[PDB]
Design a protein around this ligand. Structure first.
Ligand code: ADP
Ligand code: ALF
Ligand code: MG
Ligand code: ZN
Lengths: 662, 97, 87
RNA sequence: UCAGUCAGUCAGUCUUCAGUCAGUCAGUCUUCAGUCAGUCAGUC
RNA sequence: GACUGACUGACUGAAGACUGACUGACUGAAGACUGACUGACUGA
């Protein structure tokens, strides 16, 4: 029953006949159906005229691949065409070009296509006819969509050089909120819309102007409700005087109060400086106080227990690493820490003392679910993964939650160095369970703010989140249910509600501006569009030359040193790379220098100081330990400067690969 | 210097006591949407001895004065916000009389 | 040609050949044959382009051959076209 | 009416850096369970 | 003629750990350039 509602057909009218264009409707008005219907017409008409016609659907988040695959494309075209849903996780058994050569409707993630296009056999953009691009507002400065569209745009200008051609496939892109690039001018807003349009090579925004009231009947504005809180507990201040004593021992000036982002930034940078000097007795202290700071930050966000466990785990493994070498400022720390931490665990265990935010959260959950009486799905959006997982535990523990029938689970993306990484198969079944409804409360992160189509979402909740305007429009859109309630929770300490306010005004700017561009004069539209097209290309070329000149290298010039100690580790010639991917050292005396340690299939490298260096790896039948450039210090031979790099790509050195004859 | 993220008219529409530098207001008043002097009630002007030949204060007060005379033309009105100005030394314009 | 009613600049290619760039750099300084400076290199909207300062030059009219100078651009009653960006 | 010097305010154009977080992609390895089929060896 | 034990491969299913790179948003800091306006001083 591919029967569109009136406004849908209305805004689809220009699309039915060429005219690569854009469609934007407010969230929850089934744009996917417009895509499906347009696709059917395109393929059928091309079949009537008998030309090779295909269509590729690009999505930017893995979960949506399976959703859009089995929810809107399978059920409507099981008899008419060959639709295949492919993502980077599914184990292919056939090359991408043959995958496309077999089917005709593809649903894939954009990174796959771009990979397949820079492999010049690969594939050419011309092989396609219709390019459906969902959630294309991400078309911005060097994003995955921008690369693909820049190839398309380059070819178009080449065609214009030819005229004074090769067909360029028709383009469609779906948005809900193009947004502004942080603009307090009407000019910058409308400019920004134009920049998106040109980079999409669109023709007309084409947003509804006829069937307004029925639209007002379909979409529902959720009810906004504010939960803002602002109890004294020594634990915060207990950590305070401990860490102030720590800072005063080395008599550091904070330049700001503790527990703040500037303090953390200062701590990291000064720790880098101290390591540059080679200053021990300070470096370690700086790192430890930093650890306290992040512990406090988690502490304010979540319950006491996990924050303590984080610190306890760090110091436990710290002394574990230290005692390995057995087989002055160091002990200066644990001695006081361990008495204090025993006391803290005594203080932390007391559940009567509680965070302010968590309190209001409990109030909100209970109020909403009880008022709903077993007809309620709620989505809570957070910031950090461990926040999601700990909040899941917090739901688990207090039995007062379960009595109300709330069933909770945590959903995060794949891939760290923590409790446990959740894998793709698990989240796939998790969303399956959520749709069924015996998982009643879902705790999610950034991963699932764009595209979820659960027909029952009475509750959408934001937990201390700060973000741009699109990440708020979409969040309000998720409540795809009647009497939908959108709740913001935060404490007045930070800039949260003010971010909400500015986001609101920015939203209104965006609507007015898109109405403004909606009514421009076609020739001026064309001129401005063309000029913008040019601008992107020339700037890309300039960046290209800048980068290639920036790349500028003796593979022996440098030598590596510890940070905790400064003992020379090895020279430039000792390092070899596996598959351009992993640096490693084979030197046998260098094997004697370090220490292995296990808790194991892989061993961790430990210095004489106790600092880690690398991990044991086995490759092509060889046994061999690798190293991380973060763990070391670079020393040149022309200039004796002490430098560090978080990753390997910064270092301009190039290494020989692996003589495997050894 | 502070990086705004919201237009001046909405800044005023949100709060009620503003502390700003005069050039900001005058910029926002010659943009005829902008803002109208009538939107305010009390204008505290600190160190107003600088009110002189084509200074930042003189422009603003000249809009106010123009409206006042228009009001007198109306009478023979639109409220004009109350004005306060603080000085320590009005001084003389180089006068030996 | 002017950028945003703010910065005067010249695009002419032979005029590009006349002057000299110099660096001590992200921007280059223009140098005459005499060695006197003329302007500074600037990059705008993806284009590479050197500007000029009216203080560095001398104006010559065609109705009256008078040699005049101006410290700033606002004195000069001339009005300039903006930037054809199609190049 | 003008010039010169100095100080102050405001607005554009850029280039670039660090830190944390989240998402996407590709490798090298290792390990396990279950079923089925095949080859081989013993004592009767 | 029947019994048992062990080996190997293919298929399927699952997944525990490692490391690498690109990208975005946020915050913080930030070097240069240029433009115009206004006042004070002095001078004719
Ligand atoms: N013609 C229609 N009849 C009934 N429901 C429709 C129709 N068109 C759209 N919908 C609704 O739209 C939903 C799909 O929306 P979707 O496209 O996933 O959201 P968005 O447009 O925000 O991406 C379906 O659940 C369906 O209920
Ligand atoms: F409008 Al949507 F996913 F396309 F919420
Ligand atoms: Mg959608
Ligand atoms: Zn060491």
């Amino acid at each position: 029953e591919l029967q569109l509602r009136p406004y849908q057909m209305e805004v689809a009218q220009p699309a039915l006949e060429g005219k690569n264009i854009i469609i934007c409707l407010p969230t929850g008005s089934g744009k996917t159906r417009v895509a499906v219907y347009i696709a059917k017409d395109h393929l059928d008409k091309k079949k009537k005229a008998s030309e090779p016609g295909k269509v590729i659907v690009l999505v930017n988040k893995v979960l949506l691949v399976e959703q859009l695959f089995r929810k809107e494309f399978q059920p409507f075209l099981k008899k008419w065409y060959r639709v295949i849903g492919l993502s980077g996780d599914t184990q292919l058994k056939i090359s991408f070009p043959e995958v496309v050569k077999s089917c005709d409707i593809i649903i894939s993630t954009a990174q796959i296509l771009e990979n397949s296009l820079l492999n010049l056999a690969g594939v050419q953009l011309s092989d396609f006819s219709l390019i459906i691009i969902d959630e294309c507002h991400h078309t911005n400065k060097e994003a995955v969509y921008n690369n693909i569209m820049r190839h398309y745009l380059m070819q178009k200008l080449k065609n214009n050089r030819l005229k004074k051609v090769i067909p360029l496939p028709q383009i469609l892109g779906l948005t809900a909120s193009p947004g502004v690039g942080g603009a307090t001018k009407q000019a910058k807003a409308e400019e920004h819309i134009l920049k998106l349009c040109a980079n999409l090579d669109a023709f007309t925004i084409k947003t509804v102007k006829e069937n307004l009231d029925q639209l007002k009947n379909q979409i529902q504005e959720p009810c906004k409700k504010f939960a803002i809180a602002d109890r004294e507990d020594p634990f915060k201040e207990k950590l305070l005087e401990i860490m102030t004593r720590i800072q005063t021992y080395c008599q550091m000036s904070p330049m700001s109060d503790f527990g703040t982002q500037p303090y953390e930034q200062w701590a990291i940078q000064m720790e880098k400086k101290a390591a540059k000097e080679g200053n021990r007795k300070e470096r370690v202290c700086a790192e430890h106080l930093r650890k306290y700071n992040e512990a406090l930050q988690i502490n304010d966000t979540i319950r006491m227990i996990d924050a303590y466990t984080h610190l306890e785990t760090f110091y436990n493994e710290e002394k574990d690493k230290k005692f390995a070498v057995i087989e002055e400022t160091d002990r200066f720390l644990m001695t006081l820490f361990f008495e204090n931490n025993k006391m803290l665990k005594r203080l932390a265990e007391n559940p009567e003392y509680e965070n302010e935010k968590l309190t209001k959260l409990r109030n909100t959950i209970m109020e909403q679910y009880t008022r709903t009486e077993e007809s309620a799905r709620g989505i809570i959006f957070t910031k950090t993964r461990q926040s999601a997982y700990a909040l899941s535990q917090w739901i688990t523990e207090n039995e007062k939650f379960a009595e109300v029938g709330v069933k909770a689970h945590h959903l995060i993306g794949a891939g760290s160095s923590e409790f446990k990484p959740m894998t793709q198969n698990e989240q796939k079944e998790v969303i399956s369970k959520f749709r069924t409804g015996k998982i009643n409360l879902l705790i999610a992160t950034t991963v699932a703010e764009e595209g979820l189509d659960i027909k029952e979402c009475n509750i959408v909740i934001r937990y201390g989140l700060v973000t741009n305007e699109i990440a708020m429009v979409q969040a309000r859109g998720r409540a795809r249910a009647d009497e939908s309630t959108y709740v913001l929770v935060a404490h007045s300490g930070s800039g949260v509600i003010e971010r909400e306010t500015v986001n609101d005004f920015r939203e209104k700017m965006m609507y007015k501006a898109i109405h403004c561009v909606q009514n421009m004069k076609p020739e001026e539209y064309a001129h401005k569009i063309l000029e913008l097209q040019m601008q992107s290309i020339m700037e890309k070329k300039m960046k290209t030359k800048r980068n290639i000149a920036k790349h500028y290298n003796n593979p022996s010039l440098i030598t590596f040193l510890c940070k905790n100690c400064s003992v020379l580790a090895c020279s430039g010639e000792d390092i070899h790379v596996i598959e351009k991917m992993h640096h490693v050292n084979m030197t046998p005396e260098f094997k004697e220098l370090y220490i292995v340690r296990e808790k194991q299939i892989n061993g961790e490298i430990i210095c004489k100081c106790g600092q880690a260096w690398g991990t044991m790896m086995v490759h092509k039948g060889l046994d061999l330990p690798c190293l991380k450039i973060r763990n070391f210090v670079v020393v040149f031979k022309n200039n004796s400067t002490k430098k560090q790099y978080k990753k390997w790509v910064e270092l301009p050195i190039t290494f020989p690969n692996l003589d495997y004859s050894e």
